[PDB]
Every structure is written in structure tokens, then in C-alpha cells.
Point group: C4
Chain length 350, copies 4
């Protein structure tokens, strides 16, 4: 049995397993082009999507991140009327780009229709297991019903899963099973793929179709964005790094003389109340980060620095030509600050 014999053949890498190799460079960081074409009708100035989560992205977040060159995915833990109204708030703030999450439920077709009426630019079909017959069949039916809307669908973590979604007309495949900071899928179900490998395997398929992927989950620092893009992601999706900003939906708390905000998985127990299956996320708090504009400024600055190191004048070169080097945990220790008592907080390092 080939299936029995190859049970443990596959290997997987995540962000902390790899570094990008410096290469000959002709481009300064400030001259790098960060724009990316997600689909023929959807181009971003910076390759960053904000996560469709009820503690990350409502209209306030989507407005802030679109003004920085990204796009926000308004979460679906609200009525169809409310979610459409959030989209109208974004479009009425200068015609900014806006995306909106939908599930595979009995309201999906009406919800998509009202979101399109509100001016939405992308529909984000968000499911725990995108590589399933019922999901692929509904997606294909959505694709034929709404022929002109940009469709993001996920999540998958394998070539075969990304191919199954591109085959039914998905424009953008969202990649990531288990890497999220608030996620417990891998300890509760035992299922996942290390995220760098998942990006790489799915990007290989996306290139064959001429489409794009979103690297979703597990990003901890600006350098992880560069790794995610160089592994083949056309853009990334961020929760943890946008959590605790002014524009995120919560209100700040004071715990032990310091400001925090709530960040919780959409599969946590509390989040599923807001909208049977056992939880696959936890509920937590993160330190108050400040404004989205300031955070994106640091992220973008890390991407530009990385691309100056790799000689990437645009994201295409970073995706196609940047090489990695594998490292051990000892290499990870060398990569972070070591043998030093940090006295002042850096704006891009905690």
C-alpha cells in the first residue's frame, strides 16, 4: 500500500525555519514597488488584507487599512443589513476598497447580493475546510450566479485543495490551516500544514492558473510578511498584528496599569455565541498597539527593507527569484536579539 508506506514522507517548514538570503541589489528600499494585482479588477498598493474577524475588521478598520494601501475584510458576525451597512461606510469614505466575508450557510446568496449592492469589491468565502465537496459545490454555484465579483475562497493548505478551488472559478485562494495565533485547530483536530510549505505548495498551483493566493495566519513580525511573500504569497492576511489597534472593534481595557484589547478566534466559544462543533480557537488579550497607520508604516518599512536586501524591485521578483536558507532553532535564537536586556521598546519589535 503506497498510502501506508508514505504516511510520513511529507516535510513542512514554517516562518521560524527559514531566512531570506541577501542577493545582488539595484534597488533602494524606498524605491521598491509594493503594489500587487490580486485580480484584473482588484489592485492593492500594499499587499495586506485585514482579517475577517469580529475583533479585527469592521468599517473603521477597513477604512484605515484601505487608506494605507490595503483592503479590509468586514466580518460576518452580524446581520446582512448590518454587514452591507458597514460596506457603505467604507465606500462613503472616499470610494475606498472594501471586502466582506461570507460563510457557506443558508443566507449566503442573499448576503453576497446585498454586499454587492453596497459596492463591495471582493467576496471572501471563509470556511474552516475549503477542500470539501459541499463547499466547492456552493462556491461554483456562487461563481456562476455572480460572474463579475472578485471571489476569495479558503482556507486550504495543499496543492490539490488550491487546485479544486481555482477549478471552479475562484479568483484568489486563501491559504492557511492552523497557523493563526488564536487558533487551536492543530491541537484539537491534529490537522495542519506548516505555513511556509503551505504557501509554497499552493502558490505553485496559483502560478499555473495565473491567479493569486493570500497567505493567511501565523505572521508575527514584518519579516514574516517578507517570508510569506517570497514563498509565493501575492499578499498576506493579518489578525494578531492588527489586533489592539485603535481602529479594531473592541474598546481598550486597563489590566495591571497597562492598556489591552480583546483578540479572539472566530472559532472560540465566545465568538460562536455571537453568531454542534467543538471550539477551535481561544479568547485572549493583546497590548494596545496604537493606530493602524503607525503599524502599517512599520510593516511596510520591513517589506521595503527585505526587498532591498533581496534585490527585488517589485513583488513579482520577490515571489519568483528570492531564495531561502534553512536554519535550526539555534539559528532562530541568533536571529532575534540575544544576550541583551532590552530597555526601550522598538516600534517594530516587542
Amino acid at each position: 500500500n503506497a498510502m501506508w508506506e508514505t504516511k510520513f514522507a511529507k516535510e513542512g517548514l514554517t516562518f521560524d525555519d527559514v531566512l531570506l538570503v541577501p542577493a545582488k541589489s539595484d534597488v533602494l528600499p524606498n524605491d521598491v514597488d509594493l503594489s500587487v494585482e490580486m485580480a484584473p479588477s482588484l489592485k492593492l498598493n500594499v499587499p495586506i488584507w485585514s482579517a475577517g474577524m469580529d475583533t479585527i475588521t469592521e468599517a473603521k478598520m477597513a477604512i484605515a487599512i484601505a487608506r494605507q494601501g490595503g483592503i479590509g475584510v468586514v466580518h460576518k458576525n452580524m446581520s446582512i443589513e448590518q454587514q452591507a451597512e458597514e460596506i457603505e461606510k467604507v465606500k462613503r469614505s472616499g470610494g475606498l476598497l472594501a471586502a466582506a466575508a461570507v460563510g457557506i450557510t443558508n443566507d449566503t446568496f442573499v448576503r453576497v447580493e446585498k454586499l454587492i449592492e453596497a459596492g463591495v469589491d471582493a467576496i471572501v468565502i471563509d470556511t474552516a475546510h475549503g477542500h470539501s465537496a459541499g463547499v466547492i459545490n456552493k462556491i461554483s454555484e456562487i461563481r456562476q450566479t455572480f460572474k463579475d465579483v472578485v471571489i476569495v475562497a479558503g482556507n486550504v493548505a495543499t496543492a490539490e485543495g488550491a487546485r479544486a478551488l481555482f477549478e471552479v472559478g475562484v479568483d484568489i485562494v486563501k491559504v492557511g490551516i492552523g497557523p493563526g495565533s488564536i487558533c487551536t485547530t492543530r491541537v484539537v483536530a491534529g490537522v495542519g500544514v506548516p505555513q511556509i510549505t503551505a504557501i509554497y505548495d499552493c502558490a505553485t498551483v496559483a502560478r499555473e492558473f495565473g491567479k493569486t493566493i493570500i497567505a493567511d495566519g501565523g505572521i508575527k513580525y514584518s519579516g514574516d510578511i517578507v517570508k510569506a511573500l517570497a514563498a509565493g504569497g501575492n499578499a498576506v492576511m493579518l489578525g494578531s498584528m492588527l489586533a489592539g489597534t485603535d481602529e479594531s472593534p473592541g474598546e481598550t481595557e486597563i489590566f495591571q496599569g497597562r492598556q489591552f484589547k480583546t483578540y479572539r478566534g472566530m472559532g472560540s466559544l465566545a465568538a460562536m455565541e455571537h453568531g454542534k462543533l467543538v471550539p477551535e480557537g481561544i479568547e485572549g488579550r493583546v497590548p494596545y498597539k496604537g493606530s493602524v497607520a503607525d503599524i502599517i508604516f512599520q510593516l511596510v518599512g520591513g517589506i521595503r527593507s527585505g526587498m532591498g536586501y533581496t534585490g527585488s524591485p517589485d513583488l513579482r521578483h520577490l515571489r519568483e527569484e528570492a531564495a531561502f536558507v534553512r536554519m535550526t532553532g539555534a539559528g532562530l535564537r541568533e536571529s532575534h536579539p540575544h544576550d541583551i536586556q532590552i530597555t526601550k521598546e522598538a516600534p517594530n519589535y516587542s
Copy 2:
């Protein structure tokens, strides 16, 4: 010398070394079939055995877990009359399934006979080193004396050990040398096999015989059960995850304003008093977990979630067709929640 030259050839994986790869799925988690045939006369509704330990399973535990679809192994740190009486309590609670542990001692044959008189469904011949001449010879003699009883025998961690036990008529081989949470076998004797590899090597033999194995020890989360089953285990045995429940034999203590219960290895010093050799277990305490019904509900929910991800409609497909991906410690860090202060305890994550 081939033995000298191959001293370090073998490699071993445990649960934290691997993840299950998501695959094309046609089955929702709630429609998954969790039943397993351990032997022609013994079928379980959920593939879970409770450990034959004096701080895990007496009649109260065996009743609770059988009512959830599993089976309990009543421990043998009691007289023959007492252990038979515990079995009668289980059978008088609605004819529930019941198993009972026996050693290889001078009372084994009488103890097995009285347990069969009490209505026991499986005999669990529990030994530290199942792959030994004296144990295999007594087991074979038990097999010929009691021809119709389901026999579990262990523990082994190699193909040759599992084969030696199946060769003398053992119905179910219990697998695990050293992985137990309360176990020190590997630091005291230096002996063991990482548990995923041990399950896989033994399951390969079990398939040749048409018999089954129990993956015993080292399970920390519900996702480890899915890994254990996908590595070839027909069912798992749990101590740590059932420790501290209402139905476990101890009484709850209050330490620093919180409830705990005693959990100790059957090879710890205190456990061997209750029933020379140096200890191979420690004595500890675990937080109070609540009822067995609530804990099994979370475990079962993780198994169903995992099988929906792998597209396994029953445990046979999970055993034969699910693939793994290997990961580093960095991948393990990504798999658990990271970079977040958990504020609310999840029912399936500590």
C-alpha cells in the same frame, strides 16, 4: 558486525513531530462514524479505553466511559474478590462493557476466571515488558485455558514484539513503552520508542494478522488521539486526560484555592505499596477536570473535526489513507496558540 554498524540507524517520531494533512472531504464532522471493532465480539462506539490505573479506573469510571461509547479497564491493585465485584457493578448498570487488568503473577489464572464469572468482556494482560519469554509463555497458556475471552496484552513498542503476542492468540496488542505522562521508564532505564513510530510499526503487524492495537500513553490533547488513530491505532488508552474527573477514584483536594486530584503511575513508589524493582513512575496532582461525560464530549468532538478535515468517513479510512506532514519545533510553536495572553479557559485547551 551488522548490529554494531546499525546501532543508530532507526528513527522515531512522536505526536508533536507530526500534523495530519487536510484532504478532499465528503463528510461533515457530525456524520463521521467513530465506531471500531476491537475483536469479533467487542465493538466500541468511540475508540477510547480508560487506563487500568488505581487513580483512573474503578467501577465508577468504567460505568461513565462505557456510557459514552468507550470501555474502562478496572485496575488490579485490589483483591480478586474486589476486582470481580467492581466488574459486577458495571454489568449491573445496564449491561455496559467492562474490561479488567491482570498481571503475570501467581494469582493470574484464578483472577481471570473470577473476572470472567463476573461478566468481564476483555482481559487486559498488563506488563511492563510484554516482549519477554516468560510473559509470552503465560499469555499463550491463558489463551488456551480461556479460549473465548477477548485478550488484550501489552505493552510492546516494536513490530517483533507485537508479532510475538499475536502469534500466541492475543486479540488486541497494547502499544507504548515510555510515553506516559506519569512515566519515567525512559529516564530510569533509558528504554523506549517515540509513540507515533511505535504505533505505526505495530499497526503494520496488526494489519497482517487482521487484529487490532491500542495506542497507550502520551496523549495530551484531542488532536493527539487523531494522530494516534491515523498512525494505525484502532483505539487509544487515556490516563492523563481522564485524570481528575469526578468518576476517577480519588477525592478532590484544595491547593492554593483550586481543586486538584491525585494522578500517579502504577510504577510509582506509592502505587507499588498498594500492591525488588526501582520505581518507573512519579506521583502527582492534576487540576479538577469535571465530569467524564463533558471531557469525552470534547475529545469526540476533536476526533470528528479531524476526520472531517481528512475526509475520513470512518476510522478505517483514517487508519489507511490519512497522510502526515513532519514539522520542527518551530512548527509546533505555530501549531499551539502563540503571541497571545489567553484570558478565558477553553473547554479543550489548557
Copy 3:
């Protein structure tokens, strides 16, 4: 250049990298033979040498460990008259075995002569770098001067180093560069070999000569002794595990309501005062352990347990036939107790 190209070819394992595989066994732990012939005139009942260190072995320690079946190496941080007098105390306690450490200094020949006059059974030529021209030349000269004395010489960590010492008539080669608990050789000089690999490479040479080796340093638990012997060591040398016993030279201190004893490297600054080069050891304290008899009882019990698991009826079988399995750090975590609050101290686990 082959030397340039193979700079990083070699790989090395230590105790925490490996486990012993259980095998078919015909021998109970209590029936195992632990005796070992170190040289034609030197046989031990248990394969354990106590370290020649000024906080481990003087006459009191050598007496206690010889009474348990081992042999003690009286340290040389004392005059020739004093060290010879310590040996007389051992021989006057029932003719017990006794060994004594010598350096390569300008008193070595007189010191060896007086120790032989006192009845010493083995001379332990202790040097930091045994694989050096000056050391090998003095050793060869000692071998020809004292033709009938058992000679231990070390330390080396490679086949070529062990071969160089056996070539000049060394009876027993002591193996270990850097693994000691109190040792900083590897961080100060950058030099060493992981200890399991060092034992294995040197044992390969020892078998060709028909001689023996002592696995010296890095032993943390009784299971490490079994790994050390199965990797090819004929016996082990212990410092850390005998430190803090009643029979060790220090007096007990009380720190924060608990008893401790001093344990320090013979290359620490303080130890070199007692007897230029930069220190290669640290000075520390360990918890009070109790009597040597009780500690050896636990160690011996772990060895017997390990050999029952591997089916080794004597140490020859363990050396020649026991197989290992390699494991990751995740496997190490599974091997120790995990996910449990230990409440009672085990006699063989801290």
C-alpha cells in the same frame, strides 16, 4: 582540499538524542549480570567509577563505592604522601579496590610509585587533552616503567585519540571532552564531541584492541548509564550523580532551609587554586543526596531494568547487540514526565 570540503561532514549524538529499543528478553532484571572486566586483573561488580575530583572522591567515597561493587578514583589535589595515605585507608577497609588520579607533571613518576606502594589497583592518568604528543610520550614512558599496573588514560573523544593511547599500552581509555555537568570546555574553547557519538567511536577502537573504555561525563540519570554502556562503554564515570552524598568530601550547607554540598570542576578557578590557563569549569552547589549506598542502589536498579528491557543477560550483550532509536526534542519531552505537577520526590527522578 578535502579538509576544507569536509569541515561540517561529521554528526554527533548525545544521551538526550537517543533511546534504547526494547527487544525480546529471556532475563529478569534481578537476574542480570552487571560485572565487567576492565583489565585482566581488574573486575568490577557494577560498572561504575567515581570521578577523580576534589569534591567527589577521597578515601571515604572510594570505600563506599567499592563496597557497592564499583571503584573510586582518589583525586590528586593533595600531596603524594596524602594521596598515598588515602589509598592505604581504602585497602585497610577490607582490601577494597582503589584507583588514583595522576597528572602529567614533574612529580608523576614518584606519585605513581608511591601509589603503587600503597596498594593502588589502577592509575588514572587524567589530562584535559589526552590526544597530544607530550601526553602520549609520557604515558608510554609510564607504561614501560610500571609494566604490571592497570593504566587508565584520558581524556579523548575520537577513534584516532583512543587508538593513540591503546598503541602505547594503555589498558583503559577514558572518553569525554566537554560533556561534564560542571564543564565549560565547549563554551570556552569551542571544542567537544557529543558524548554518545564519542563513546561509540572510541568503543569501536577498543574492540579492535581487546581493551575497554570508561564513558566519562554527562550522565544525568540512571537511564543515561544504560545508554552509555549500550553505546559501547564498558563502564561509566560519575561526578554529578555522586555529588552531594555523605561520603563526598565537602560538608553540607543550609541554603534557604535546604541542605546542599559544593560541586566544582577541577578546572574551575577555585579548584586550580587548591593545586597560565583560563578556567574550563564552574563552581556550584547540588542538593544533598544522602548515602552513596542508596544512590548506587537506584542507579543499579535502573541498569537492571534497562537490561531486562533489551534482553541483555550481561553487559557484553548490551554493548554488542542493543539497538538505539533517534528522537527529536519533542521525543525527549515525551520521555520525561509531562503535563503533571509532581508532588512527591521520586528516589530516581528529581
Copy 4:
């Protein structure tokens, strides 16, 4: 696409991944030759450069380290007149060797000229990404303008980067992208090479040209210097290990009853104020270390000890002939002191 297929082919090692193998030795540590020819006109008695950082090296540091056999790189976070004046202070302290850092800015040519007028011995062209067209072109122009000055240029971490700099007449290539203790390049930009591999790849090129390299960053102990030199570095550059000395520019602070000094990356926010791009360093404090003379004495003593172990009579033999052994994290744990409560601080181990 070969670039796509080889995205993860490369592997990298750092100091904690490797140990030096002991070898046959004819040379005592005190007889080892530590001198190194960096360029035909620049020879050092010990192979150590002090880092060109505003919390490490001004005239006071450069004087102290030159008096120990090394050379100091006076940092450039000061005017041209001030930096030239610091160099005059060094030359007026007995004609000691002195080096000075320059950037690639609009003052570089005047700054180099005034530093040469002051008697500087080496120019250290310090850039974040030495493998860039603009940097290589300015360096080549500096080489043709100042034909007789020793030129150090960096930093690179690849063979192709080192080759590009040697091709334009650089005498000494400085190697290290990301390993620095105060450095965040690898987490902010995602870019780097584990330092042992980076030294080895660049040294391979340096040998073809007959030139030299400086191993810059990540050195934590004296043993790391030996590893860095044996991996092919002709000398090392130190920040962390010289930070907090009397001769470093800061003044000592008292924090919680203990003395500290400020150590900060030249890419930290505060350091860039002293002289847009996002920070790539943090600001911290280190314990007060004492005098440079005492620290160098310990470092040099570790190098001599290492070379006695490897049988290296001079640095050429260490570079060309010393072999390494690879180890896991378990091997790293064995290499440091373990299972001991250090009571007295060692002069070469924290």
C-alpha cells in the same frame, strides 16, 4: 523554473549548531601563535576587531584593544573633524593601530581623506547591504582614489557578495547579516544567513583571492571566536563581548543594586537620531564587565585552549584543517553547564 524549485535547497549553521573536534596536538596553548595578516601592511597580534558602534569604540576603546594586540574601529556617529581627532588620540598613544568606519554618504570621500591624514590604518566601509550596485560602485571609486589604504568593506553573507567586493579591490570583507546580539534585521526584514555558514561560504572566496574576512556578529563566548576562525574567518569583530567595559563610551548606571552600561544597535531608533528607514536594532543594557585588558585576556585564553585541542600551532592551521561536528539542541545543552546551581561567577562564563 530552477529558482522556484530550489527555493529551500540551502542549509545554514550557526555557532550553537557545531563543535570543534579535538585532534592530535603537538602545541601547548601558551605556545600558540595568534597573529594574523589581514593585509600586507596590517598585521594583528590577536585576531580581534572592536565594533564600529557608538556604544563600543571611540579612542579610549581603540587604545585599549590595540594595546592587547587587536585594532579598534572608531565609529562614524560624529563629525569628520571629531572622528579624525579620535584617530589622532590613538596614534599619539604610542603609534597604535587604528581603524575608522565610514558610510556611503555624500561626505565619504572627504571623511576618508581626513582619516588618512590623521594616520588611520584601515578604512571600514560599513553598510547594511554590501552586495548592492550603488555600494560596490562607490567602493570601487574609493579604491581608485585611495590606492594605498587598507579597505574593509561589508557587510555580506554570501560567496557572490564577497566576490563582488574583492573584485573591486577590497582588501578585507566583513561578513555577517543578522547575527548581532542587538540586531533585528532577521525579524524586521526576514533576511539573513546563519553565521557559521556565512563565514564558510565567504572564506571560500577569500582564499581564491588571497585576501581575508572578518567574522562580524553573533559571538557570545570565547569558544564562538574559535568556531568563527575555524570556519574560515581570519579575525572576528566583537560588540556584545566588549560592551560594558570601562573603555566603552558610555558611563555606568546602577540598576537594582548592580552596574550596567548602555549597548545599542547602530540601526536602533536612538542611534539613528545621533546621526526614512525603519529600525533594525534595539537599545539595551549589559552588566558592567570591567577592563578591556581583563576581558581580552579571557578571550585570548579561550582561543589558545581551543587551538591546543585542535593541534593548531597558528591560525592558518585552524582555518584550513580543523574539523567540526554537528550537534542538536540536546548537544548544546550538554555543552553548557547543566544540572548544577552555579554559585560563583566564572571570569569567562556568565
